A paper describes a structure:
ATP-hydrolysis-coupled [name] polymerization is a fundamental mechanism of cellular force generation. [name] polymerization powers fundamental cellular processes, including cell migration, organelle dynamics and endocytosis. After incorporation into F-[name], subunits rapidly hydrolyse bound ATP in seconds. F-[name] polymerization is coupled to the G-to-F transition, a substantial flattening of the [name] subunit that renders its nucleotide cleft active site competent for hydrolysis.
Replacing KH2PO4 with K2SO4 produced intermediate severing, suggesting that phosphate specifically caused the substantially reduced severing of ADP-Pi–F-[name] rather than altering the buffer’s ionic strength. We therefore used cryo-EM and iterative helical real-space refinement as implemented in RELION to determine the structures of ADP–F-[name] and ADP-Pi–F-[name] at resolutions of 2.4 Å and 2.5 Å, respectively. In both nucleotide states, extensive water-mediated hydrogen-bonding networks stabilize the ligands. Notably, in ADP–F-[name], four water molecules displace the inorganic phosphate’s oxygen tetrahedron. At the helical-lattice level, the refined rise was slightly larger in ADP–F-[name] (28.1 Å versus 27.8 Å in ADP-Pi–F-[name]), which accumulates into detectable differences in subunit positioning at longer length scales. As is typical for helical reconstructions, the highest-resolution map regions were the filament cores, which revealed a continuous solvated channel aligned with the filament axis. An analysis of solvent-accessible pockets indicates that the filament core is accessible to bulk solvent and features small channels that connect to the nucleotide clefts of the protomers. This positions the filament core to contribute to extensive solvent-mediated lateral interactions between strands, which occur at a vertex between three subunits (Fig. 2b (top)). Consistent with previous reports, ADP–F-[name] rapidly depolymerized within 5 min of cofilin addition, whereas ADP-Pi–F-[name] largely remained intact.
Author numbering:
A (entry chain C), B (entry chain B), C (entry chain A): 5 to 375
Amino acid sequence: TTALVCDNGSGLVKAGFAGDDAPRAVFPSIVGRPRHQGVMVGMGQKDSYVGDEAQSKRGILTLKYPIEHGIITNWDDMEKIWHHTFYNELRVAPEEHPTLLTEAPLNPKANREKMTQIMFETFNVPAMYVAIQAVLSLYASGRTTGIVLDSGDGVTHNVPIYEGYALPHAIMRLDLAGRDLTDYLMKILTERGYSFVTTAEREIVRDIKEKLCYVALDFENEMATAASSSSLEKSYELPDGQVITIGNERFRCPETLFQPSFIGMESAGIHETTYNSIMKCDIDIRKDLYANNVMSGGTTMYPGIADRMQKEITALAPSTMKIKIIAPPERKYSVWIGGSILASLSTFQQMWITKQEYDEAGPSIVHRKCF
Amino acid sequence: TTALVCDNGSGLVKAGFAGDDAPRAVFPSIVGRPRHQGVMVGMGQKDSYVGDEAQSKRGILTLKYPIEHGIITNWDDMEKIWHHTFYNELRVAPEEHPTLLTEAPLNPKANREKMTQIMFETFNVPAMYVAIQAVLSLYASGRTTGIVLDSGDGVTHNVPIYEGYALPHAIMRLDLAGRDLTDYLMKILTERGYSFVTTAEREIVRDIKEKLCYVALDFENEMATAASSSSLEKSYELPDGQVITIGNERFRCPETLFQPSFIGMESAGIHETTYNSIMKCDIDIRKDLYANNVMSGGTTMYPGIADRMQKEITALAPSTMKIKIIAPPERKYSVWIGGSILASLSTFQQMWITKQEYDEAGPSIVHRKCF
Amino acid sequence: TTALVCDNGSGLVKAGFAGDDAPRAVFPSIVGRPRHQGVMVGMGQKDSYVGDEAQSKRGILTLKYPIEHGIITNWDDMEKIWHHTFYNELRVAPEEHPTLLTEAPLNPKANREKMTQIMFETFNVPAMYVAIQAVLSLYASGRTTGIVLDSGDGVTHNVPIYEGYALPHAIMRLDLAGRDLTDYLMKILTERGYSFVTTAEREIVRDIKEKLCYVALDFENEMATAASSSSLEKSYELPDGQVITIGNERFRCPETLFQPSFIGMESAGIHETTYNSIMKCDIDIRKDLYANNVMSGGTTMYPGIADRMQKEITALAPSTMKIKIIAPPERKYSVWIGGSILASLSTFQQMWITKQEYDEAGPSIVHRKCF
Ligand SMILES: Nc1ncnc2c1ncn2[C@@H]1O[C@H](COP(=O)(O)OP(=O)(O)O)[C@@H](O)[C@H]1O
Ligand SMILES: Nc1ncnc2c1ncn2[C@@H]1O[C@H](COP(=O)(O)OP(=O)(O)O)[C@@H](O)[C@H]1O
Ligand SMILES: Nc1ncnc2c1ncn2[C@@H]1O[C@H](COP(=O)(O)OP(=O)(O)O)[C@@H](O)[C@H]1O
Ligand SMILES: [Mg+2]
Ligand SMILES: [Mg+2]
Ligand SMILES: [Mg+2]
């Protein structure tokens, strides 16, 4: 049969079929409900909206994310999103297809236990499997050795792998990702008199961040350049026709990744996190780890982030080591591509958690069979 | 059965049957009583006259409007007018027909409470409903999204609606409409030596306003043109054969809608009111609101008012927005047409306030069931 | 010398001298201009009126607030108000006194830049400083640890402080305050047939709100009590002798603070805002924050608001935490009292921005020296 690969991220849902080169369905992972009163009768109105239909009508809706920091917090909305993905986007029968799901490392066990329970009971899938997103990203690049830096909307994490072996004690997890950057940009936009307070306005700020933000190679030099002249300013048109102009915010927003103290976090930056993850591994594999830094996720798509990470890691690493950052242009879907590749492999077909095994063992079997 | 749609405006009464394309009965909402002494015996004389019979004999009558600024102030005369509408104009049995009534937004609650009480007790209707006039106007145009500018004889108001959802906090209400314009024209006609002081003469001034007034595209240029020559002057024949000539008054009278300060009001014009109502809505629906400005009411029938409103809103709106004014030729009866359409809908048949519900709950049920 | 403390709020101006226990001058921050025509010659008439003189003659004036939502929007009127405060109220020479000014957090930078420029150029003050209002309120209570809820006429904001250290990432700002409540009461007064439309009538509605509104401990029980009987009704006399009676509106008006959806806002209430601000701080300071909730501003003077906030925060906080609301009877002037205390401190005398520093650095120095 044909397996289903579903990457349930905090911000976007990636779904498709195993063997394909790109995900079939990509849409935001949101559920919207009306907050005003309906005075017009005879027209089709629904109590909830999911995905693009919620984005289109966001002006009269309150938008909620069921997944927060890679943890599912509203299982009703998550089930609604899964139903939407299975029926309206891919248009498939769930019980006729094994499904591969993704999860961030160091997550609560109950999250994947409930994922398995929902998949086996509500949708009655024949088989399912839960994988780590960082390993799938390594699969997508055709590599067996390297350290993967994956940063999406909720979670940023590092996983070092050498010759197909993972070192769990060196796994790092950070709760700073895209959504936090969007909130910080939303806060700092008030310096120029721009006020965004609603969940519909938050999406507008996210679009502005995606379309106008970049990572500066040197932060203080960029600050001086922005203070000296107006060559770095850009204009953006709001949906109602208003035009806003932003200056140093464009690179101030992504700077939080390297300086988490901008949002009040004591943790270190992504470069120092990667260096510490490398230094926790055996001395005989650090040289290979230094040359196989793999980037994945939407938050790694800022212009100039790879050069900045290269510079920082070079400044941290010994001068005789060769630092190489791997940033494929398609790294936005590396997790899904690796999941499809894994589901297409012949040797993986006996690693599926089947319905019989679940009926015998309960939801706890995902701990024994998956990682 | 067949539902009855009655639009009780400040100036005119519109009545008919649901499913019809036009109101069956249209007549002024006035009650007249003699003010001289009857010296002739043996002839049929009545203590009161309603509607067209009052208009025909206005020379010996004092005319009173029971509705003032969309608020009923004389319930005895209002009951007389309702009896006239039910029995002499439509010629129907009130207890055999559900009745749909209209009301302006931001009205006193006691007004509709007494309307419901009168309908259920005096006329013993089986069911009744009170709708908002601007919503019905939106129904008449076959739209679910737009901002409605309704201006009749007593009230001018704006109601923005998006995807069938109303935003009550953005609803505007103005107490400048046709009657105020008639009074202002009555006052300014004294500059040419014309004196109208009675309620019968006020009707003559209203006819003059309806037949000779228009909205100037640019007020000061029209002023200069009227001062330069006499190309804008028109002649009107009084009922007794006298002929009057008016110049700049023709467009001075409707100018009060855009400059309320002409009658001593501090409020802004209709264009600024519409712009402020649009700006109070969510940023993601303002573009659709800009292109769906719907006009309704008799006061919107001045020649050239739509172009003036388009110009003003374009001058107020951002240059990249598309401003479109919708002014149907039948907008004089948009409220009644929308009411008939709503009463003809199948899904509305369970929204009627029935006699049993009124007997159970009292007059206050109209607040819970209607809007 | 003697420093000047000026608290420029959206609704009122508080001014005086450092070291005093109360502000010397309190008057509304309004500028009024005549809207009728002057027909009497030989009498003293002015083109503008400021403060109490504008309030006294409001019947023939249009009233404008130069400050909107803590942001100065009319700098000419603001300069007129500053001139009035300096010369007619305090009767002092501006160049002989350093001046301390206040501002709300998360404000546009250009606002304080222009404030500094106006103070240094137009009035030629020797030194000036801009402080955050919530910090000054904490100064007034003799505390170094606590979370301050300040709500005036334009802005409501929360600032948590622990051991003299502020956590900027946990600062909350809300654009719902007294003026919005006045507008909502103005809108809901139409349910009883009372119509207030002018800026002079808006002041009357504000007086009614100040004199008759209170916060209900339980909203639905108060609704049921008001519906059952008339024990909650009060009477108010209009300036022309008319008497109005209001029922549930008295506590419906302040309820918008806890339910912003009454005016169409998606944001949460003040209690939930305070709880979220507390939860964003470090876990080791939340216990001290829970017991030091400080109220400040005119909008916190509603009867029963402190008990309602205590109940809500207790319902939100863990059952083992001790919730304490600090509501001094003089919290109406807490910002000014704290500003005077700060200006009287010996260690603050070197934090003044002096004329030499401004001449060297330009208006941008307020960003580097102030917070
Ligand atoms: N061009 C871009 N520049 C910066 N950030 C981006 C860009 N495109 C997407 N993002 C951000 O990436 C995040 C979503 O990416 P994704 O890896 O799909 O996250 P998740 O897997 O958590 O859904 C969002 O926060 C989005 O704003
Ligand atoms: N052709 C016209 N030009 C200008 N005003 C008109 C015209 N026809 C009617 N009116 C005015 O419209 C008002 C009544 O219209 P209508 O919408 O029926 O009001 P209502 O619903 O309050 O009775 C009256 O003031 C009348 O003078
Ligand atoms: N007793 C009261 N009850 C309720 N509101 C009040 C009371 N006294 C003053 N206010 C309101 O407080 C606001 C002004 O207080 P203030 O803290 O001086 O604001 P600002 O600093 O913005 O001028 C006004 O909206 C006023 O109506
Ligand atoms: Mg992801
Ligand atoms: Mg009408
Ligand atoms: Mg204040």
